[PDB]
Design a protein around this ligand. Structure first.
Ligand SMILES: OC[C@H]1O[C@H](O[C@H]2O[C@H](CO)[C@@H](O)[C@H](O)[C@H]2O)[C@H](O)[C@@H](O)[C@@H]1O
Ligand SMILES: OC[C@H]1O[C@H](O[C@H]2O[C@H](CO)[C@@H](O)[C@H](O)[C@H]2O)[C@H](O)[C@@H](O)[C@@H]1O
Length: 711
């Protein structure tokens, strides 16, 4: 059942008005249907037509936003009673009564239709069902601090002219907004030959001159609107006094252009102010998906292997005890890599010893200070002797603080001259300071580490990486540490002294910690209690009744070929044990004391005791009630796995000639029992039960089947 009527998460629409019903409730005698109302009706129809539940809840959140916006724009509308009722219906259809704290956290995020709420509710439901790891609370914390996701949208929702030939990220709808700002960029000495009396008058010149030269190529004005194709972060790292001065290679013009964009922006977020709604939404959902990946990557990271090589208290002295050349040999030939801190001192040391790295097989240089998503192609251009790398060039000027000689430039130059691969592993999204928040820092670091894993720890590669210290070693993560590039890549991080000494950079204890948290308001744990919800559906037999024949593969696949014969011998022994057969029970309800007797005989047979297993589920009863039903088994332990020994399974429907004692690996046992019994929302705990602990063993209560129970 991929869409079960018994799932609490079925997103049922029984309590949500259809468009025809809305039409009568929201009708106003003299008022024709405006554009806002039409789009509300259209979206309501799409919701009711939606068969894919994830899309359905997505559309519902979008409708909530439409209503929010309408309420804000028309506070005296006589349609508001109907719209508010509809909004409450959608809230109740999505957020069940036991999800109050979740609902509050998620629906407090502005722009309910941005994708954030959809993603967060999807994650929450998967977490509650036991289909994803604990992540919702921390993904909410990320969303709440993120300068895009948490910002009430104030950008551009209009259409994009077909003349535009690049993907648009930002639009300034009315160019006159540039004349509203305090600074008169038109008075500045650099633009006196142009003869212009306003900021908006300078604008066409700045762009045209850019296009013909190199910079701001993805900016166009059409009919009083400015369309931008360069990302905020791309512009920030390629445009500054370092790269843009009077008489400089890129002159003042891009800086002037960007400076007034930022003045227009004011106290708003850049994307909040200027993004197209489309780019805004994409950014929201991409960031949440990437963060989730980063968080997942930190889960159960084992620091043991890394600490065994580099984590001894005296590793730094051992590193320092080697000559420089012995260190280079060890990094290249044994570790297959090394990282240096982001400093010009480190880069100069590397370049001064470059021959030695090359002689020991160096294949590649990687740096986090350039974004691959913007300049990887241009880097490839530089390396091949092309001149098409102006953005790269500007970015280098920024990195080198305008220094012509510049370490980053020199590093790149050396890769070309020496035919060594050069890789950017930075990722531009969310890369602009301030990094005054550990979630933004984690997001940014995670994307860089992900790229480095994909591109750097590969057979036949000997590499050096240059990165900011915050990327190198561990930093605070979500409920646990975020390991650094160096931990993930199995290499040491290093730094070069003011004395020019090359030394180890230890992973300090104070950084290898979780981010410090305050509980989210009234938060309830989402993850289920014990063992496992098998599925939020009714289970059924696929074929007919299981048989010993059908069960054989499950047994032989549970163990390696060399343990197979011994396993089958033990299974034969149990099935042919006189005392075990005496224990066989098949009258429903009278077998509750069987499992401890089975465990006792297994012990006397010399087998290893298992914890056992229990399964419980819901069953339809007369007058729309549901009862809990359960079963339990002892087990023996062999080759690391538990095997149910269930001498009372014949109390349940079965093949006519079935064996009296059911033996399967515990998971296969649970599945068989659930299917035979047409179990609804079955739940497994990996311990055998007797007496009260068995009789009242029931699935998590949120899984007891419910009506949609609205209007
Ligand atoms: O955009 C409309 C309002 O949306 C949010 O508030 C709603 O959702 C909260 C969480 O469920 C409720 O506490 C609140 O009563 C609802 O109005 C947002 O927090 C508000 O600032 C918006 O005005
Ligand atoms: O630019 C200020 C306005 O920003 C918001 O409106 C934009 O975003 C909405 C949702 O994408 C669109 O429906 C609307 O067309 C856009 O202009 C904000 O909602 C407005 O109150 C502001 O005036």
């Amino acid at each position: 059942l991929g869409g079960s009527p018994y799932s609490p998460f079925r997103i049922g629409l029984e309590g949500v008005w259809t468009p025809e019903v809305l039409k009568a409730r929201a009708s106003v005698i003299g008022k024709p249907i405006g554009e806002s109302y039409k789009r509300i009706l259209a979206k309501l129809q799409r919701i009711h037509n939606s068969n894919i539940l994830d899309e359905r809840q997505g559309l519902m959140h979008e409708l909530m936003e439409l209503i929010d916006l309408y309420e804000e724009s028309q506070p005296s509308s006589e349609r508001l009673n109907a719209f508010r009722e509809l909004r409450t219906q959608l809230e109740k259809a999505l957020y069940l009564p036991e999800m109050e704290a979740l609902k509050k956290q998620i629906l407090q995020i502005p722009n309910k239709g941005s994708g954030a709420a959809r993603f967060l509710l999807r994650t929450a439901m998967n977490e509650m069902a036991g289909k994803t790891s604990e992540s919702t609370a921390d993904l909410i914390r990320f969303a709440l601090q993120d300068t895009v996701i948490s910002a009430p949208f104030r950008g551009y929702a209009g259409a994009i002219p077909e003349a535009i030939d690049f993907p648009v990220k930002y639009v300034i709808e009315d160019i006159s907004v540039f004349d509203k700002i305090q600074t008169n960029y038109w008075e500045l000495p650099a633009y006196e030959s142009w003869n212009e009396g306003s900021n908006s008058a300078l604008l066409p010149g700045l762009l045209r001159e850019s296009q013909s030269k190199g910079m701001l190529s993805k900016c166009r004005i059409i009919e009083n609107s400015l369309y931008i194709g360069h990302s905020y972060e791309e512009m920030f790292y390629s445009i500054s006094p370092y790269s843009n001065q009077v008489g400089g290679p890129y002159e003042l013009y891009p800086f002037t252009f960007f400076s007034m964009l930022q003045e227009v922006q004011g106290d708003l977020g850049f994307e909040q102010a200027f993004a197209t709604r489309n780019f805004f939404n994409t950014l929201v959902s991409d960031r949440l998906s990437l963060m989730e990946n980063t968080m997942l990557l930190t889960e159960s990271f084992d620091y043991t292997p890394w600490d065994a090589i580099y984590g001894d208290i005296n590793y730094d002295e051992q590193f320092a005890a080697m000559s420089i050349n012995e260190r280079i040999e060890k990094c290249m030939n044994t570790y297959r890599g090394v990282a240096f801190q982001n400093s010009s001192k480190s880069i100069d040391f590397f370049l001064n010893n470059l021959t030695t790295f090359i002689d020991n097989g160096l294949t590649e240089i990687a740096i986090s200070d350039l974004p691959y998503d913007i300049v990887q192609q241009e880097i490839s251009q530089f390396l091949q002797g092309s001149n098409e790398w102006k953005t790269l060039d500007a970015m280098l000027f920024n990195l080198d603080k305008g220094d012509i000689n510049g370490a980053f430039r020199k590093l790149l130059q050396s890769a070309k001259d020496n035919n060594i691969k050069f890789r950017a592993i930075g990722h531009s999204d969310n890369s602009v300071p301030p990094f005054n928040n550990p979630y933004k820092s984690l997001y940014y670091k995670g994307n860089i580490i992900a790229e480095a894993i994909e591109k750097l720890d590969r057979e036949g590669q000997k590499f050096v990486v240059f990165a900011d210290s915050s990327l190198l070693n561990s930093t605070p993560g979500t409920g646990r540490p975020m390991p650094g590039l160096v931990q993930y890549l199995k290499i040491p991080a290093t730094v070069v002294d003011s004395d020019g000494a090359w030394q180890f950079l230890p992973d300090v204890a104070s950084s290898r910690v979780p981010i410090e948290v305050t509980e989210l308001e009234n938060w309830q744990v989402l993850t289920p209690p014990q063992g496992k919800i098998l599925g939020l559906k009714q289970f059924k037999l696929t074929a007919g009744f299981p048989t010993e024949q059908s069960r054989l593969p499950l047994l032989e696949n549970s163990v390696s070929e060399d343990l197979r014969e011994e396993l089958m011998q033990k299974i034969d022994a149990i099935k042919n044990d006189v005392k075990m057969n005496s224990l066989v029970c098949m009258e429903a309800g009278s077998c509750d004391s069987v499992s401890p007797k089975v465990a006792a005989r297994l012990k006397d047979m010399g087998l290893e005791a298992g914890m056992g297993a229990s399964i419980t589920w819901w069953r339809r009863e007369g007058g729309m009630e549901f009862s809990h039903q359960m079963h339990t088994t002892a087990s023996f332990k062999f080759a690391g796995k538990e095997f149910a020994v269930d001498a009372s399974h014949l109390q349940f429907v079965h093949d006519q000639l079935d064996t009296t004692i059911l033996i399967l690996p515990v998971d296969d046992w649970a599945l068989e029992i659930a299917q035979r019994n047409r179990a609804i929302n079955p739940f497994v705990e990996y311990v055998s039960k007797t007496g009260n602990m068995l009789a009242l063993f029931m699935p998590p209560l949120f899984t007891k089947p419910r009506l949609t129970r609205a209007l």
